[PDB]
Design a protein around this ligand. Structure first.
Ligand code: FAD
Ligand code: FAD
Ligand code: 2PC
Ligand code: 2PC
Lengths: 340, 340
């Protein structure tokens, strides 16, 4: 069959791989090709902190909780492998600081070693009087993409720099099945008011002495609209902005002072940190992830399409689960066509 | 008063600073000076890993449990301050793997968030079926020694590169009080059958992606005669040797293999870790830390002496609790001499 994936982010490449690994043996020419107007490190995936943590609230679709859980285990099963770090994967323990007592997250048991913070530990962060501690994983979006690209390439998959203007051209181009992993820009290919950008700015800095992630929470200003320090492989990520509706791709000094001044107050040792870089990205916000099939006829050419976008600020946290689901829906596309 | 501190390690410098800050305001000339035949980075403290962690077995001396506690609370309180990292101090979380069940360490309540590992986590470590997880602190001996030095420098204390041949030469040289912090070579100035070296070799390596510490235990081969991965400030420490009675100051190939192969089997990502160095030091092994006074007359010259040595593998872990004890004993010397 001829598969066409649009999107070179974590959802694009992970879904492409998951599809190939699943049906390359049963399907003869499985022409999977990737179409993107910008590849790594130019994606939102590259700008991501990398940490594995869903929101503090339950998703509207419990399927997502399932997909997160599946993504943790998939990545957890890699801990103990020599190529874990080369995939951009490594463990990290950390805190979630609250200005007041909050209920446990739904993902409390998904993560490793969850427990509430003792007052003795809160003494480290005076601005907050409640929190959680747990162990999770780092999935450096950039490193993970270079890996997936490296993996898919050897799988025979071809990448093409192309801004898809419509599903039309792709279908008539020869696409038997089209996987739409276009993120926050999906509305172009097909209008969806539910998808809005969740602008975020970060400050990548050299502060290697920082091992633990630290995520503070302001219940009034919204999720990730509070400072956070999230260590990665080669650097640390400082952030604290989530602006929904903002399409400004430029870094503003206003947010630079909120992040820095906030993070530096969180961790005073940050004063010695050498700023490596600063970026801005658009989290694909949607009331719920769009992962479903859709048939599209274009003059007899009934082209099947499967969407997978709207992952907001948990794209790396949910990538494998969602990808596994697309492959499941791709099987049904294969069997209704009697192609299996 | 003229105080002569013998030893430029964490025990010398820390005890030196603890006495000065203690009596500089009440004692007019407080001639404090340090004598050492080797300074950082050529001390045992410079080779140390930095992790605050006593032995898994209880001590014969209940004072060591307290001194350990006092040291943790001292270092912990530095967390939240801007200079913690410049002192070589940073929080670290990690595991303690056993090949079988063991009893909880007396210091379980001293650390942060102590709890037993679960079957789910233990699966990560195929060679180990038991253990614990907790949060601790790193105290990079090298960086800390560079810190105490500069601190004491500005305090007025002078440092002299001189190999003391006997307490006598010092006692007759104008020393009203001597503080013995000579480490494992303490036996020279005064023989000690109980004091023996606990030779250790380590492998510094560039593996920044590693955030947690893993300390494996082989109950048959003794403490630290099993691989351990302790990440530090700028690098990662790989270890696994504790050979008492061994005075060989040369790095052997045998131990290199023990550490490398073991750690690389514990943490396979180590295959990409570029080695930065390889070191050998001698732990001041003693059934119990010697911290006590000793009057020594040298022909009317009654020189008071205060020993502080035999800290083995928990020097960085217990330094402050010991140093704080010396300044107390030193307080008795002063008042028994009517100098207060
Ligand atoms: C500052 C910040 C920090 C974040 N931190 C985290 C974190 O710690 N953990 C986490 O899980 N998530 C985090 N996220 C969110 C995470 O980055 C996203 O959920 C994830 O990147 C979404 O993946 P995606 O598949 O949509 O790919 P995206 O990279 O958004 O897009 C992939 C592809 O879409 C292609 N594309 C789009 N439209 C077209 C078109 N018309 N034609 C052709 N190609 C097209 C692009 O070319 C691109 O290659 C963060 C986000 C931001 C902004
Ligand atoms: C491989 C290894 C790893 C370790 N890891 C850890 C760890 O993770 N955590 C931990 O808490 N501990 C650890 N330790 C133990 C720790 O290093 C020691 O407890 C600590 O260094 C002891 O300090 P010290 O006072 O003996 O000083 P030392 O540095 O041993 O000695 C201080 C000074 O004594 C001077 N001196 C001695 N005799 C004389 C003399 N006659 N005249 C003049 N000067 C003299 C020397 O010049 C020297 O500079 C480790 C030890 C080793 C070997
Ligand atoms: O998108 C984001 O800001 C984050 N995602 C995981 C924790 C922080
Ligand atoms: O002596 C040693 O090697 C260690 N001390 C505490 C952790 C490792």
């Amino acid at each position: 069959m001829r598969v066409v994936v649009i999107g070179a982010g974590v959802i694009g490449l992970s879904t492409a791989l998951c599809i190939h690994e699943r049906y390359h043996s049963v399907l003869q020419p499985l022409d999977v090709k990737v179409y993107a107007d910008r590849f790594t490190p130019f994606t939102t995936t590259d700008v991501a902190a990398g940490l594995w943590q869903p929101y503090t609230s339950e998703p509207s679709n419990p399927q997502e909780a399932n997909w997160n859980q599946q993504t943790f285990n998939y990545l957890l099963s890699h801990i103990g492998s020599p190529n874990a770090a080369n995939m951009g994967l490594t463990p990290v323990s950390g805190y979630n600081l609250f200005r007041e007592a909050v209920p446990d997250p739904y993902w409390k048991d998904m993560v490793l070693g969850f427990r509430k913070l003792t007052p003795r530990e809160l003494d480290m962060f005076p601005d907050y009087r409640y929190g959680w501690f747990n162990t999770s994983l780092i999935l450096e979006g950039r490193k993970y993409l270079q890996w997936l690209t490296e993996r898919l390439t050897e799988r025979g998959v071809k990448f093409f720099l192309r801004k898809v203007e419509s599903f039309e051209e792709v279908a008539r181009g020869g696409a038997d099945v089209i996987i739409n992993c276009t993120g926050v820009w999906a509305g172009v290919l097909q209008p969806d008011p539910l998808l809005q950008p969740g602008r975020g700015q970060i400050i990548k800095v050299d502060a290697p002495w920082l091992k633990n992630f630290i995520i503070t929470h302001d219940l009034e200003r919204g999720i990730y609209n509070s400072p956070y320090i999230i260590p990665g492989l080669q650097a640390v990520t400082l952030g604290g902005t989530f602006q929904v509706g903002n399409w400004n791709e430029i870094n503003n000094i206003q947010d630079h002072n909120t992040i820095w001044e906030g993070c530096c107050r969180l961790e005073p040792t940050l004063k010695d940190a050498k700023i490596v870089g600063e970026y801005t990205g658009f989290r694909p916000v949607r009331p719920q992830v769009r992962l479903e099939r859709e048939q599209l006829r274009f003059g007899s050419s009934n082209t099947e399409v499967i969407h997978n976008y709207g992952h907001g600020g948990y794209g790396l946290t949910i990538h494998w689960g969602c990808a596994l689901e697309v492959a499941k829906l791709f099987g049904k596309v294969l069997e209704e066509r009697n192609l299996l």
